Design an enzyme around this catalytic site. Structure first.
Site, PDB file in Angstrom:
ATOM      1  N   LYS C  43       0.892  -1.208  -0.114  1.00  0.00           N
ATOM      2  CA  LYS C  43      -0.065  -0.204   0.095  1.00  0.00           C
ATOM      3  C   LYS C  43       0.944   1.359  -0.087  1.00  0.00           C
ATOM      4  CE  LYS C  43      -2.741   2.157   3.183  1.00  0.00           C
ATOM      5  NZ  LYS C  43      -3.530   2.031   4.573  1.00  0.00           N
ATOM      6  N   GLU C  69      -3.883   8.336  12.547  1.00  0.00           N
ATOM      7  CA  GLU C  69      -2.605   7.440  12.360  1.00  0.00           C
ATOM      8  C   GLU C  69      -1.919   7.217  13.479  1.00  0.00           C
ATOM      9  OE1 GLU C  69      -1.324   7.334   8.701  1.00  0.00           O
ATOM     10  OE2 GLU C  69       0.742   6.925   8.944  1.00  0.00           O
ATOM     11  N   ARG C  70      -1.635   5.942  13.651  1.00  0.00           N
ATOM     12  CA  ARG C  70      -0.644   5.169  14.697  1.00  0.00           C
ATOM     13  C   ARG C  70       0.616   5.779  14.485  1.00  0.00           C
ATOM     14  NH1 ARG C  70      -3.254   1.733  12.344  1.00  0.00           N
ATOM     15  NH2 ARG C  70      -4.388   0.046  13.116  1.00  0.00           N
TER      16      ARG C  70
END
Lengths: 252, 116, 239, 48, 126, 265, 120, 116, 128
Positions: C43, C69-70
């Site tokens: 991705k 987001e992490r």
């Protein structure tokens, strides 16, 4: 735990469990009359757990390379991972180890549903030695789960084989409580399994096989065990030594 | 095993495995019936059905509901009894003989009373 | 959002330089593309090639917005953009990173998308470029809005979402479009709750999508990169 | 005993270990039964 | 009296539910499975009852008795309805002393059971 | 209509679909093993039967009827009982031997008194000469097949995978072989009862041939039944997944509504 | 033209000569033979393709030479020493014990084809 | 029965039994189909499919949607029509003949037309 | 639309779509704190559509014979017509054209599902 992380050391934290923590936060939130939402949780219950869990980290060299690793626990209800709190935590963490009652009763303990478990980090976090044999373990099990149902008289060559390995590989992963195994004890067992050296042995004897094989290796091939532990990798020489030691024990 | 002993713990595990296998196979039975099962699978189902029933027990306090005199069974007889079953020592005995009784001696006694 | 009268009157293709995409599920210029697929499907490499290709082919910059987001994955994404060349500290970069981490309060996670979007808009309006805007994940923008709404004491709608679900989505999406000056095109990672496509969040999101790029493990297991499913991937502009 | 029953026995002897595959040991095995019928009720089942 | 005759009627009707659920697999059946499937099918039929038509205990006892012990087992299923009224009419004419004992004592001595056994068998063949 | 009601209804179908789908594939495997038993029996059917075409052998009656014990094989047993019954109108006093429980039921319902022998437990494995013979053995012993002026074998004939065909074939007795129009085109030694054996052997061979033909027809019927079962079940799954997601949604809403009404006061 | 067929395997269905174990004694069948119908005893069968010989051991059954001169052989079980002592004698000695103690009749017959196979 | 008479009640009851038997079998039918039914069930379902069609009726007001003139059937006619179907007197008649008509006569008349 | 209707002319009106209208109305209603009902719509969401669609009419000769024809659009979820908003609108309009995803995917377009589509009053107006 952050004291360790901040000082170039490494800590592991177990939150047992975050389900019941959510429930305490929900008690305070409702009694302070803050607005309720899904399952009466306050709209910052996600933030509660994400604030907590992003504190687990691997620091850079500049900052001492210290580490904090989190194993949060979540209890589901009837296997429902869509409930509000499990949804939250699942999407915050880096993967799931999923346990199931059905497997537990089957004998499979720890009761890990392999198809549903993941580690988003993956290989990077694996001793190379284990990765060299675990790579194909993931596959043989995947192929085994597809053909599981075929386990009941007229079955062709290939699918009968996938059934033979699968059952034995599944059996190798059974492990008694309070009995964690060193990596150098892990690799010879998975090596044996994955390469087919177990296929001839009957399903009920895999447990006694593990015991005898380990002590035979500690008695006669301790040099190989020591190389696995110390180098963490497997040269083509090690592979062939293992192959010989395994073939040797199987026949006996 | 640390508490009940290894023998007790093993019988327990294997009783539970037999039972779960039976739960597992119940969908093959409901649609394709008993004929389609493996040799070793048929034997597991027959032992499971006995085990399910053997786990039943007439309570002393439940006598008004059953008309059956209540039975109390010592832990050590329970272990020995179920061990024997799992080893196949009572495979020729029909299901109903295991229903609503005490230990293994009761099973043997009902079996002979049903045949006569 | 740009005025009704300011809108382009014809849909047109944004040429990506990726064969599967351009042929089977072409991106709309000034449109929105649903990017489907989790980890282990290349991705981030796919995103980074779009950044590269749009800059080399159309001379347009990109903005990548991590919504919820992490932090671990922003650190990974940044370290990987430098290794790949799309970011170059010593030279010229092609992409702007805007991050609204999971551990930030709902209000932050709900506005990050607009922050990223505004940087992207400037390149369109002021510099007349065809711009890319990446939003990972648009579902997380929805949940943040649910959480903010709940916190303000508003009565939740179906399935626990905020009553302003559709207008919240429209106030973001309507800004991604083609004008006379240029265009913003958005590639948006879409999470489906419970795999239920009728869930309010995906159903509302899908109304704005013009194409989908589906990255699949079945395609990569066959050794095909980019791992784009040629049958699943659909585009309204395939006409 | 009949001519094909006789031939059967002569084919089952010439049966009864590595050339003796599964479909050979099976061709020598039957789980079949015969029940007699009249008026219909039966005269109780017997092995073939 | 009602208890005596309805011994395991509940458990038996449960055995019947099980056995009927199985046979729906279109498989052939043995003496045991065919017998209980027969008995349970008639017992169910025996318990059907018109509205506004409550029966006395002394009327219920002999019906249940004829069912449970198997005196109905060889009677066509569609005829169980007419058997009910005719058996009672027979009992009211000939064995009326039997009924009175049941109503006034509310119990069945070993002798009453024997009397009732023979009174049913007599009726089973016209 | 409750969520619980829906979730267990959906897992139930999900298993039915998985079962039939395995069963369909177990069938294909079982069928290829049956095409090898069927080609090897129909070749011996033209080697054995070529004699009779030439000796031009031509014909109370014995009907041997062949299906199995197993269901979920379409209309194998029903339309063969059709063939038998249609034949049994033109001669009702015939004696019947049933091979396989299913055909015994079909016929026990419609002609209970004609049935005199029933063979059992045939469904499972492929058919074998040992069974054919042991069956042929009882026909001679108990049923006295030797004395019958006519012997019919009824069985199902696999036209293709998609279609089978109920068929009848005659067994000629000792007397009938002897007296056949062109028995004299052959130089048979008339020493020890040869037409006796050429009949007892044909009883077995021709039965085997029919059983192997009925088997292959049944397995193909079960494969196609399991195919439609899997497909129909996989349709239900879809409809029930959608009902499931509606209901899951509605439970969250309705639960939220109570929580909200309780928080308004 | 030969049709040799077993129930489980068809073996042959142009040949120069076939040898069959008929009613009493062995028989040779050439390209033109007058139609005969013969039983086959539990013995050896030899097909010829020129000077090429291929022997079989066989259960029994039936030969027929048709008008068109085609030969038809059938048997249940059908290579000589290549397939068939210790395998044999363990069962065959145990037959003598069954002749004393129904089962007596069939067991008795096992001796004629067991002893005939050992004689080749 | 006190209002409509025993015959009408009995017929109504038996129609309901037939239909319920068909309803209870929906699942098995949808997955496995007619071939897996027993012989009683296959008859009952075949009859239930007719009763169900026989319960349809052309309405005068719906003439535009059905394409057929509307029919008004009398109570007594309805009782005798259904009574007869239940008696298996029209088992040989194709389902389609029961669809969208009046009483039993219409059925017989439609069955004749289709034979052409 | 009504102007043409009232002045002896004919208008067609397409409401694309009422699903999104009803989603908007539910936003006001929840913000105004009106009690949520089915799928969190307000009790009066039927009325929202009913009063709207009743305005489409064929007027008499006395009123000038104008007409307003309405083609409202409703979006289903998973082809479910039994849902609240879909059935409210079915119980207002004079028939439906149902478009089926399965037909659409096969390439049958228009994807009209003939058994589920109906015109309640259109026959009398169909060209002969």
């Amino acid at each position: 735990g952050e004291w360790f992380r901040d000082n170039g050391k490494h800590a592991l934290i177990v939150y047992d469990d975050l389900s019941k923590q959510a429930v305490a936060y929900r008690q305070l939130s409702l009694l302070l009359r803050r607005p309720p939402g899904r399952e009466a949780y306050p709209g910052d219950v996600f933030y509660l757990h994400s604030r907590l869990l992003e504190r687990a980290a691997k620091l850079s060299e500049k900052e001492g390379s210290g580490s904090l690793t989190a194993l949060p626990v979540i209890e589901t209800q009837g296997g429902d991972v869509s409930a509000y709190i499990p949804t939250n935590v699942i999407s915050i963490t880096d993967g799931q180890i999923f346990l199931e009652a059905e497997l537990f009763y089957k004998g499979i303990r720890p009761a890990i549903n392999v198809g549903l478990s993941v580690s988003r980090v993956g290989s990077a976090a694996q001793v190379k030695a284990l990765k060299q044999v675990a790579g194909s373990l993931k596959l043989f099990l995947a192929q085994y789960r597809e053909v599981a149902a075929f386990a009941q008289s007229d079955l062709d060559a290939s699918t009968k084989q996938t059934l033979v390995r699968g059952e034995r590989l599944t059996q190798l992963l059974k492990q008694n409580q309070y009995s964690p195994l060193a990596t150098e004890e892990q690799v010879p067992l998975i090596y044996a399994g994955v390469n087919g050296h177990l296929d001839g042995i009957e399903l009920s004897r895999i447990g006694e096989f593990e015991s005898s094989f380990l002590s035979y290796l500690k008695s006669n091939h301790n040099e190989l065990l020591t190389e696995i532990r110390e180098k963490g990798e497997l040269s083509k020489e090690l592979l062939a030594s293992l192959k010989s030691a395994t073939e040797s024990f199987v026949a006996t | 095993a640390a508490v009940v002993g290894q023998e007790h713990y093993d019988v327990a595990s294997k009783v539970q495995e037999t039972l779960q296998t039976y739960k597992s196979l119940q969908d093959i039975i409901a649609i394709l019936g008993m004929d389609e099962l493996s040799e070793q699978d048929k034997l597991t189902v027959e032992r499971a059905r006995k085990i399910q029933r053997f786990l039943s027990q007439p309570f002393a306090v439940a006598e008004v509901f059953t008309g059956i005199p209540g039975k109390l069974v010592r832990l050590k007889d329970t272990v020995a009894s179920f061990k024997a079953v799992l080893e196949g020592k009572y495979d020729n005995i029909p299901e109903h003989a295991f229903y609503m009784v005490g230990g293994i001696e009761d099973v043997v006694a009902k079996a002979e009373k049903l045949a006569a | 959002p740009p005025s009704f009268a300011e809108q382009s009157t014809s849909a047109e293709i944004l040429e990506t330089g990726i064969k599967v995409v351009d042929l089977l599920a072409p991106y709309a210029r000034g449109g929105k593309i649903g990017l489907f697929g989790g980890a282990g499907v290349g991705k981030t490499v796919f995103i980074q090639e779009l950044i590269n290709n749009i800059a080399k082919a159309h001379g347009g910059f990109s903005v990548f917005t991590g919504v919820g987001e992490r932090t671990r994955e922003g650190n990974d994404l940044y370290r990987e953009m430098k290794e790949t060349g799309v970011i170059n500290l010593e030279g010229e970069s092609k992409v702007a990173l805007v991050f609204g981490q999971m551990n930030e309060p709902p209000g932050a996670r709900a506005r990050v998308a607009l922050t990223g979007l505004t940087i992207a808009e400037y390149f369109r309006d002021e510099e007349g470029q065809d711009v890319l805007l990446f939003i990972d994940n648009i579902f997380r923008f929805t949940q943040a809005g649910s959480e903010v709404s709940a916190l303000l004491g508003r009565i939740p709608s179906a399935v626990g979402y905020q009553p302003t679900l559709a207008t919240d989505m429209g106030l973001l999406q309507e800004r991604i479009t083609t004008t006379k000056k240029g265009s913003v095109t958005s590639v948006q990672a879409v999470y489906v709750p419970a795999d239920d496509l009728t869930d309010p969040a995906p159903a509302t999101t899908f109304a704005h999508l013009d194409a989908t790029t589906v990255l699949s493990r079945g395609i990569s297991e066959l050794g095909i990169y980019p791992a784009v499913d040629p049958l699943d991937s659909k585009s309204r502009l395939l006409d | 005993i009949s001519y094909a029953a006789y031939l059967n026995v002569a084919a089952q002897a010439i049966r009864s270990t590595e050339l003796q595959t599964a479909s050979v040991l099976n061709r020598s095995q039957t789980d079949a039964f015969y029940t007699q019928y009249k008026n219909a009720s039966e005269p109780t089942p017997i092995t073939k | 009296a009602l208890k005596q005759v309805a011994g395991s009627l509940k458990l038996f009707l449960a055995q019947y539910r099980e056995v009927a659920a199985f046979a729906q697999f279109g498989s052939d059946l043995d003496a045991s499975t065919k017998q209980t499937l027969v008995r349970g099918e008639r017992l169910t039929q025996l318990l059907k009852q018109n509205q506004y038509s409550p029966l006395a205990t002394e009327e219920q006892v002999p019906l249940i008795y004829a069912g449970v012990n198997g005196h109905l087992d060889g009677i066509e299923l569609s005829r169980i309805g007419e058997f009910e009224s005719s058996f009672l009419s027979y009992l009211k004419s000939n064995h009326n002393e039997l009924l009175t004992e049941i109503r006034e004592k509310g119990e069945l001595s070993k002798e009453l059971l024997a009397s009732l056994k023979s009174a049913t068998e007599s009726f089973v063949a016209t | 209509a409750t969520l619980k009601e829906v979730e267990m209804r959906l897992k139930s179908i999900k298993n039915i679909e998985k079962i039939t789908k395995t069963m369909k594939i177990v069938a294909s495997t079982r069928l290829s093993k049956a095409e090898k038993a069927k080609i090897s029996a129909k070749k011996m059917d033209e080697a054995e039967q070529l004699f009779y075409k030439n000796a031009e052998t031509k014909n109370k009656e014995l009907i041997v009827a062949i299906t199995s014990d197993k269901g979920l094989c379409g209309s194998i047993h029903s339309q063969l009982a059709k063939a038998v019954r249609r034949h049994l109108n033109d001669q009702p006093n015939a004696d019947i031997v049933t091979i396989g429980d299913k055909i015994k039921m079909q016929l026990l319902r419609t002609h209970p008194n004609n049935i005199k022998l029933s063979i059992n437990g045939i469904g499972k494995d492929a058919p074998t000469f040992q069974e054919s013979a042991l069956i042929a053995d009882k026909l001679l012993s108990v049923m006295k097949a030797g004395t019958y002026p006519k012997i019919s074998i009824f069985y199902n004939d696999p036209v293709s995978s998609l279609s089978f065909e109920p068929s009848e074939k005659p067994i000629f007795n000792a007397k009938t072989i002897e007296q056949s129009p062109s028995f004299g085109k052959f130089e048979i030694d008339t020493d020890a009862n040869v037409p006796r054996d050429l009949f007892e052997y044909t009883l077995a061979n021709q039965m085997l041939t029919a059983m192997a033909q009925g088997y292959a027809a049944e397995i193909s019927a079960r494969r196609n039944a399991m195919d439609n079962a899997s497909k129909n079940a996989g349709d239900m799954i879809n409809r029930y997944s959608i009902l499931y997601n509606r209901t899951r949604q509605a439970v969250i809403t309705n639960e939220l509504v109570d929580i909200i009404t309780g928080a308004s006061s | 033209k030969l049709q040799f067929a077993l129930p489980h395997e068809t073996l042959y269905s142009e040949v120069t000569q076939v040898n069959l174990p008929a009613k009493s004694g062995r028989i040779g069948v050439l390209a033109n033979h007058v139609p005969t119908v013969e039983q086959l005893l539990p013995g050896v069968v030899e097909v010829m393709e020129g000077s090429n010989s291929k022997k079989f051991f066989i259960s029994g059954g039936f030969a027929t030479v048709q008008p068109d001169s085609q030969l038809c052989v059938t048997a249940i079980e059908a290579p000589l020493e290549s397939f068939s002592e210790n395998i044999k004698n363990l069962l065959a000695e145990a037959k003598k014990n069954v002749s004393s103690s129904r089962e007596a009749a069939e067991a008795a017959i096992q001796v004629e084809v067991l002893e005939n196979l050992q004689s080749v």
